[PDB]
Amino acid sequence: MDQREILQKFLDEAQSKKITKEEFANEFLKLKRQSTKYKADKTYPTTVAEKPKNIKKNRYKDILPYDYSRVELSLITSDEDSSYINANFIKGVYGPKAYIATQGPLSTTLLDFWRMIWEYSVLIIVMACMEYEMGKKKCERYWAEPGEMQLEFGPFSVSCEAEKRKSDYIIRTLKVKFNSETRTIYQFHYKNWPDHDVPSSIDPILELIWDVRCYQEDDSVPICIHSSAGCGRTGVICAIDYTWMLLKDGIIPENFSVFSLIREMRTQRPSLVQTQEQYELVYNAVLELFKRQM
């Protein structure tokens, strides 16, 4: 089957998956289980995060990065450091290390955050959450805003050059400086999460992703993605991108399945796509994207 053909087979099989009872529920139950079996078997050691010297750098005691795929930091900035961080490498359509799913930086890690973005020539960050959620803190401040001068993290110096206001999302242009160097960083801010149920409310996330890749089309450098735990909303923006990567380049598998795609990532980064309502957004979005490729 050529491209357009495999899309039909998909859309076609939508007037079924949609109606069927608890389709996603029972589905999303297989993932939840997956992690379970992968777990009771100790399939993926975590000791690095389990280390005492890192437990404080863990924002959630459950959301823990995997050794096998976590990001190692080497760009030293003092003996007051470590190699550890809370983030994992996530392979992309053509190669590994194409996504860096990381948590909301704590205060004790704004530095590591910048060592990471620097020791991996990161060019884009996508904040998928707000500073405050449920009358509770979620993400610490790592960026810089107009007329605010420049913030100093360890040896890093962040400053703001300009912002771009777009519907439910902003484009902050940063200027991080280190030992004489001055790279550019286009961080993205998304505050309005799509209404998994309402259709016309998922264009914003496509728009964001459409603008990010309208900045770094290729896959030369990793794209940092984070949310409150760098899971839920994080894996959603990775899966809607990865899938659009295939779309954008006539390479959608004949047996393409939002479920296996997600199942996979979750072997590189724990709890990716954390709830049913999210598992439905990925699909609906993928289903709104396919409809558009026609």
């Binding site: 959301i63 704590l106 709830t275």
Partner: peptide
Amino acid sequence: DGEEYDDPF
């Protein structure tokens, strides 16, 4: 924020 990210449904 150690209240465990996994506390929903």
